[PDB]
Structure formats: C-alpha cells, structure tokens
Point group: C3
Chain length 324, copies 3
C-alpha cells in the first residue's frame, strides 16, 4: 500500500478482511507496530466522527497523533510560477506541503467537493497535492469523490453480518434538504464492484453517478423492484452529478425514504447508512430502530478499517532514510 | 463506581481521601492502570482549567486522551419519534451518542446552564443523555448544576489543610458582573453535607439555592455572623435560582466582597475559591495574598480529584 | 538550562550542535528522557509550522503534550493591585499563571508583537509573565522580538550544509506586502553574532534593527556589495523599527528581491528562509527552486532545535 484513496490500494480483499476481524477481536494486538511513528491528521473541513474513529485507530497501533484543522481561509496556496505574491496567498504549494511532510510518518487528509466545478472537484486537487508533494504515504479521511475508509468499514460490516457468501446488496438514494457530495455513493459502488456480491443501485431519474464508479453495476430505477430479495440495504443521499445538474437537488421525494414498505420486499434485509442520518428523510424510525438496523456496528467498524489501513501503511514505511 | 456526577458516586469519603493523598505523594503510581484505555473529553462550553487538569490526570494513569470541542449549533439532536428531519437537527440522539461511545472507554462531559429555562437546566439533559446512551462510564467536567471534580478537589484541600477534625466551613456569595451558574455552590454544598464539618451558607436575600443542594447547611443571612469562628471560607458568586429571578443578577453589593473586615472575625480561616476569581469583587488583594489563602494548592488538587475519579472508573471497567 | 528565550540560554554552541546532529541521526535516542513529563504548549497566535514541529520534538522525547490555543484578547490578565475587577479581565496574573504551571512540567509560549507600542512589544511582557510566575522552565515558540527555536534551527542548517569552517553568512531584507515583526531578523543576528562566522547584515536605509541585536555586526546598505563571496543568504522581511517608523513599511522595492542577479555574486551560496515565503517578493522561483535552496531541510531542522531545547530543559528538572 503506497496510499489509501481507493479500493485498489487495499489489494486482495481476503487478507484485508482477515486482518479486520483479527483486530476486531484483539484490538491492541499490533500496539507496538506504531511505536515512535507519527500520524498527522489534517482537516480542511471539520469533522467529529472521522476525527474520533481515526484517532482511536492510531492509538490501537501505539502511534503518536497530531491533528491540524485548517479553514478554507487559511489554505491559500499559490500554485503557479512567475507569480508576484503580494496578494492573499502567503505560501506556494512547493514549500508548504513538503514542509508538513517533515514532521510525521503518515498523513491523513480530509478534503471536500465544493460543488462549483465538476472538473475541479473530480480532479481531487487537495489530496493529490499531498500525495505528490508531502513526501509521505497519504490516506483519505474522505475526499471530494471517494471515502475509502467508510466503504472499507461498510465491507467489513457486510462480511460481519451476511448469512451467505454472495448477498444481494442494494445501494439506494433517499432525499436530503441539502446538496450532498457523491463521495460516499461513488466509493460504495467502487468497493461493492470489487466483491462477488450481487450489487444494485436504485435512484430517481437524473441522479446517475459517474460510469467509472457505476461500472457494471445493475442500475434499477424502480426502487421497489431493486429492493426485492435484498440481503442488505445501503441508503445514502447525494446531489446530482451528470449534465448541467452537477451539485444540485433534483428531488426531495420522500417516496424513496426507506420504510417498512420497501423493507417488506427484501429478504428481511439489514439496514445500513454511513451516518449522520436524518430520520424520516433517509430512513424511517421503525426501520433504523429495528433489529436489522446495524448502523451502530457499521460505525464501530470505522475504527477497524482505519486500524487496518494504518497498519498496512506502517508496514510499508521505508526502513532507511536520507541525510545530507 | 459507574459514573461520576455527584458526591454519592464516590462512596466512602475516607478511602477516596486516602487514595487522593496516596496519589499526591506518588503521582504516577497507577500509570499502568490506564494503558490502552481511551478517555474522550467533550466540551460543550469551552474551558482551559478543567481541560488542562483533566488531561494531566488521565496521563497520570497512562490513558490515551481524545478531546472534542462542540459549540452550540454543532449539537442539535433530535429526540422525538416521527420527525421528518429536514430541519436544523442533522441527527438523532439514538444514533449520535451511541456512536461516540464506540471509540473510547470513558467519557468526560462538560455541559452548562443555559439560564433561559430552569426546568431544562436542572434536568441535566446533555449529561444524562450520555449516561443513558453512550454505553460508557460518564463523569462530569462541570454540568449545569454540579461540578463534582471541583468539589472533590475542594474536599481534599480542606482535609489537607484543616487544623481540626470537623472545621467550621463557610460558603459565602460575593458580587460579580455576570450571571453565573449555581453549579459550584450547589456541588460544594452537596459535598460538605456528606462530611461531618460544621457547614454554613451565607448570601443576600433572594440568592437561596435549591433545597436539594442546601441540605442540612445552616443558612445565615448576616455575612459577618456567618464568618464568626470560621476555619475555612469558600467564596463564590452565583446568579439567582429561586422564584422568577432564575439566572438573574439581583445584587452587586461589594459589602459582600471578602476582605479583612470579614476575615478578622474568623479563626484566621483559610480562604478558598474555585477560580477564576475577580479580585476586589469576590475577595480583596490582601486576603487572597495572605498566608492563609490556599487558592493555588486548591487548584493543584483538581489534578488529584480527577486522577482518583479516573482510577475508580478504570477499576470498574469490564 | 532553566529557560530558552535567547542564544545565551543554549550555553556552549559546539555541544548543543553535537547533540543536534546526534538526534538527527537517531531521532528517538532520548525517548525515555521525557517519560511521564508533560509539555504545555500555549499559542496566543495560531500556527501550523511551530505547532507541528514543537509537538513532534516533544514526542521524540516521550513527553505528554497538551496544546492550548488562547484567542488574542481572550487573555487579559489584570496585573495591578487595588483594582476592582468588574471589567473584561477575568483574572489576575498572580492566580492565572501559577495555576497553569500546576499541571505541567515545561511550558512553551508563542507570543507576538502588536506593533502598537514599541516599548510594550520590546518588554516581552507575555513570555516574562510566564517565566516569572508559572514556576516552570519556559521556552519561547516565538516571541515579540526573538525566535530562538528558529535561529537555532538555522544555525544547525548552516552547520549541516557549510562547506567551510567559517562561511560568509548574509542576512538580507526583502520586500513584503504587510508590516512584519523584527523577531526573526533580531534573533538571526543574535545567534550569528555568537558564532565565528563572517556575518553581514544588508537592508534599505531606515530598516536598522535595535543595536541590542545588531551589536558589533557589519551592516552594509549596498545589497550587491554585501552578497559578493557569501556562502549563505538568509532572507527575511521586517517592518521598520527605529524612531517614528516602528512597525511601518518604508519600502517595497523589488530590487531587493533575491534572484539570480544577486546570487551570481555569491560563491554559489545556499539560500535560506524561515518560511512562509512570498515568491517573487522575497526571492524568485528560480533561486528558491535551485539546488542551492535549502528552505525545506532548514524547516526540518526546526524539529531538531526544539528536541535539543526540550532535552536540555528536561535534563535540568528536579
């Protein structure tokens, strides 16, 4: 593992999963692995959830942790050459990022989609600057178009609760009052496509995701049809992506809200959601509070996916270093 | 001990005190007790004193520490069923709090009195939500109506300095420009009631505290009379609690400001204050700088009460 | 070493430098030194560079670390006696600082020059309050008029890259859009004056630094003349200091911007800057991107100077 931004980085899912469950049962088995190794967690958009679970994971590995919160207004990086820097930006990319790599061994970066330009957002500018110039292994704490730590945790929980080898897993859109990134849905599809599960995506018209993420997944427009015989339901809202609707809410249709009506059609499926969840918009009180709701164990698994990811990066650190 | 929000949680005062003094002399004696145990400190009201002393205490026990700062607006939790949550609350209580409890072993919560509705403040909603839903032991880093880490430090201080078995301890109100919560005075009263000390409360008319907290204290409205023969003076301002004056300032009378006039009548009493303290409003420069002022050793003991509390909680984990 | 605010505090330079290169090659050699020791970092000005490098250093020594961020103006300690404290000042110096020292073993303080009153700034009020009242060794994470951690890192960097025993080191002013403090320039001169290097200061007329820092150093107003034969070029902008211009920008002359024109007359000199750096204002892309630019290794050395300082402060605790 040279970085952790997408499913490809984790390699064979089997050993990754083996490691996950070994750690779930013996949390500090690798507490000596990160001794005197330092993690730098950088948030360009405040978090409380990813902040806590990532920190706990690092501690499972005996690592030192340094957290930095940087507001958009404090991240003015000049990127071009020949610029007379007498304006806003007090620093150039070429000195600012490498210097941060000076004081740590691994960097976690949490970026975000600003929803003003699709190209820019999908270019994943912030995380790629750290990959390219920090001089350290970088893992994503959620980027503009993926959230691998979330997806990995989601995969761990399906493996944890599934009744068969190849469950039918359905990812469904649901309404939200705000325009949301397609980072979680993109990522979930990417990871599900990497498994042997029967994977289906249902969403209203106009909410199609990028083909590179959708891949060969069956896209069903009839939510009830898609839900039939499902073993797991993964609900998530996202703003539009294609055409000229990028970044916008095209619907707030609560008929998509996951309730007993759609769940009744499944094979008594488990209910999943990455959190935070707005009840009766994404899912009903009855469904999220039922015994098939595993949103809490799913959240607990965020500590595990982080712990395995950090373990892998720790195992991939170079043994020797440069000294002038 | 399953939580730490009031004096009752600490049980027998004698053994809690023996442990306090054992740790004062050998600070890192239990540094292994907390290895691979994670303390999550959550501040809903910013702080720096409790923040610093609590972290230092957890390190005394070798614990990992994670601090979260949540300001208002970042804590809108839905609590009702059947709500179409497309408003300002981004999540429900039944998801948010259990999730937080997933990544830690012990949780410290610092909540606060809002002052716009007494019933709500005294219901201690935020801290009770964490106790009921986190799945972890919870301790108060100051709540809306109690501050047991402070009172426990105050108790250790009085035992450390007392010149008699059952000293006369006097808690007195003093003027302040802002409306302050009843947390420290309620909590101090609650802890003094658990001792065998002679305890007196003195404050202007209208500033009475919840009988739930005043307990068996003798209330004396004449401050000079209350001070008579005192061995310890614990000064603290609080906004009104009773009637329709909840959360309001009824007085700013500096006759209550603790100076030599009142101290002269005590048995050369020690002077105590939880801090921060406004000089010449709460207490005079000469009093707070006199040999019997023990405000600093008292603040030092915040580290001790917190490590004894964290140690008791650690000893009670599954 | 009981404190670290200036070059005298480091003691013998050779020995401090020896420890620096030792730690550079064996970063965790003294990780047991700071076991159960707590460092309190206090920022009165938010930072990312100093915050990050100082925390890493403490970890190199196995220390516990607590970082406090205190908003400018949220820190108003009353210093006078007989003051009726019903204003904006929440507490008195005499209580506040000693209390913070109760919960830690070493304190790092990052203060700043407000540029409102020269004399107040040069009195280094904040760092001195901590030194005089906290009861703990204190080190500057950057003050109003010095930045010893930065200067020490710079010294390490020159020692690390020097091609000769006594290189010619030149500190040159360069233009900036805003009024910057003289802390870095004052400190670099202070440290260079302590070495046996050929040290030259070059700036526009009016940018003279306090003679307390310039001391016996050579000041050359002709930038090119100052540059010829140099082995190291240390660039930094600062606002005027002398007389009526304290804190003011007297020039933004891009003729001082360090580019190939000036570097050409040096003996292929290395280029240094403490960061952050405005390109084409302080130095051109070509110079800062050439192999003679050691701005990053210089920044890396901030970790090393802070580790040596913390190590020496630790070695001298009771």
């Amino acid at each position: 593992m040279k970085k952790f931004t997408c499913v490809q980085d984790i390699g064979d899912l089997k050993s990754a999963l083996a490691e996950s469950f070994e750690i779930k049962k013996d949390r500090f088995k690798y507490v000596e692995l990160g001794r005197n190794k330092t993690l730098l967690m950088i948030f360009f958009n405040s978090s409380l959830r990813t902040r806590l679970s990532t920190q706990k994971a690092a501690l499972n590995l005996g690592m030192n942790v340094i957290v930095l919160d940087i507001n958009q207004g404090a991240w003015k990086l000049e990127t071009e050459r020949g610029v007379i820097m007498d304006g806003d930006k007090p620093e150039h990319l070429l000195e600012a990022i490498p210097v941060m790599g000076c004081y740590c061994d691994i960097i976690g970066v949490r970026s975000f989609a600003r929803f003003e330009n699709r190209e820019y957002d999908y270019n994943e500018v912030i995380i790629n600057q750290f990959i390219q110039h920090s001089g350290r292994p970088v893992f994503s704490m959620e980027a503009a178009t993926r959230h691998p730590l979330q997806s990995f945790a989601d995969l761990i929980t399906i493996e944890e609760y599934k009744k068969t080898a190849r469950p039918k897993v359905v990812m469904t859109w649901a309404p939200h009052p705000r325009p949301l990134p397609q980072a979680v849905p993109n990522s979930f599809a990417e990871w599900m496509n990497a498994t042997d599960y029967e994977f289906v995506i249902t969403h209203p018209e106009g909410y199609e995701l990028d083909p590179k993420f959708v891949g060969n997944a069956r896209v069903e427009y009839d939510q009830m049809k898609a839900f039939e015989g499902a073993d797991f339901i993964y609900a998530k809202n996202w703003a539009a992506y294609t055409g000229d609707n990028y970044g916008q809410i095209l619907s707030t249709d609560r008929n998509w809200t996951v309730g007993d009506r759609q769940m009744a059609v499944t094979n008594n499926a488990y209910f999943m959601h990455c959190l935070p969840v707005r009840r009766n918009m994404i899912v009903t009180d009855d469904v999220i509070e039922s015994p098939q709701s595993i949103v809490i164990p799913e959240a607990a698994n965020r500590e595990i996916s982080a712990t395995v990811v950090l373990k892998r990066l720790l195992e991939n650190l170079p043994h020797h270093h440069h000294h002038h």
